[PDB]
């Protein structure tokens, strides 16, 4: 026996049924363009996660109100949404979470928040800065642009101490230029 065989594993995107449709292609390209993504997979996985959440919520809403197997996970789902900055404080019902959409999720990505916090000149500059180890959430360096930030950590994104943009020594380009100008 190999114990490593017991590790669960799964897939995170689905691909569309009809591959060549003009309106869907333009919609997806529009979203990719101003959300600074890399391919249609980065958006298909967000759609997949949102579909799972919506299916769970719809299954919950089909049950009777006085059913504990509705109350408990309804509270849990609303707690997760209010924790991730998706649902507002004025939407505390299971019906509002059915109205969620993909741009709600894409608005909470670390790249999107870095761009909207004024730290990046553009949403592509934000992704470049994230992947170059210049951004720390709380105290932890993050170099994953898909990092979904929570509300309590929204006030801690800042350039890292090691980063030249957060008080670090000059990079090899600047140091090479100083070496050239030294002699």
């Amino acid at each position: 026996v190999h114990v490593n065989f017991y590790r669960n594993y799964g897939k995170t995107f689905k691909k569309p049924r009809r591959p060549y449709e003009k309106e869907r292609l333009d919609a997806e390209l529009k979203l990719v363009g101003e959300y600074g993504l890399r391919c249609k997979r980065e958006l298909w996985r967000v759609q997949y996660a949102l579909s799972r959440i919506r299916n769970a919520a719809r299954h919950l809403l089909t049950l009777d109100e006085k059913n504990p197997r509705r109350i408990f996970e309804g509270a849990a789902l609303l707690r997760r949404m209010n924790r991730y900055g998706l649902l507002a404080e004025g939407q505390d019902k299971l019906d509002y979470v059915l109205a969620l959409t993909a741009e709600n999720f894409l608005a909470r990505r670390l790249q999107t928040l870095v761009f909207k916090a004024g730290m990046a000149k553009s949403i592509h500059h934000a992704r470049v800065l994230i992947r170059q180890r210049h951004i720390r959430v709380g105290r932890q360096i993050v170099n994953v642009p898909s990092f979904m930030v929570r509300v309590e950590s929204e006030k801690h994104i800042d350039f890292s101490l090691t980063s030249p943009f957060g008080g670090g020594p000059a990079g090899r380009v600047k140091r090479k230029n100083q070496k050239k100008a030294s002699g």
Partner: protein, 88 residues
């Protein structure tokens, strides 16, 4: 098949032994004893996995051989002795 089995697979262990699935291929088979081997907590799962006294299947022995464990008013050395309910 032709006789008794001396091995217990981790996935076949009792549920109340909350054992990490990727911790190994085998679980400690409880020895023959007072309790039914499915409602028992072997000594290996006491000095380990419940107390941090021992870290491996090498220091449970290193402290049983010192005769440091006295279950039900008697020193016991078998690391898979089945302490099963209300045993002191």
């Amino acid at each position: 098949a032709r006789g008794l089995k001396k091995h217990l697979k981790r996935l076949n262990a009792p549920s109340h032994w909350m054992l990490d699935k990727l911790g190994g291929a085998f679980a400690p088979k409880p020895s023959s004893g007072p309790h039914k081997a499915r409602e028992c907590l072997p000594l290996i799962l006491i000095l380990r996995n419940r107390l941090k006294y021992a870290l491996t299947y090498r220091e449970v022995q290193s402290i049983l051989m010192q005769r440091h464990i006295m279950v039900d008013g008697k020193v016991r050395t078998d690391k898979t002795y089945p302490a099963g309910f209300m045993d002191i």
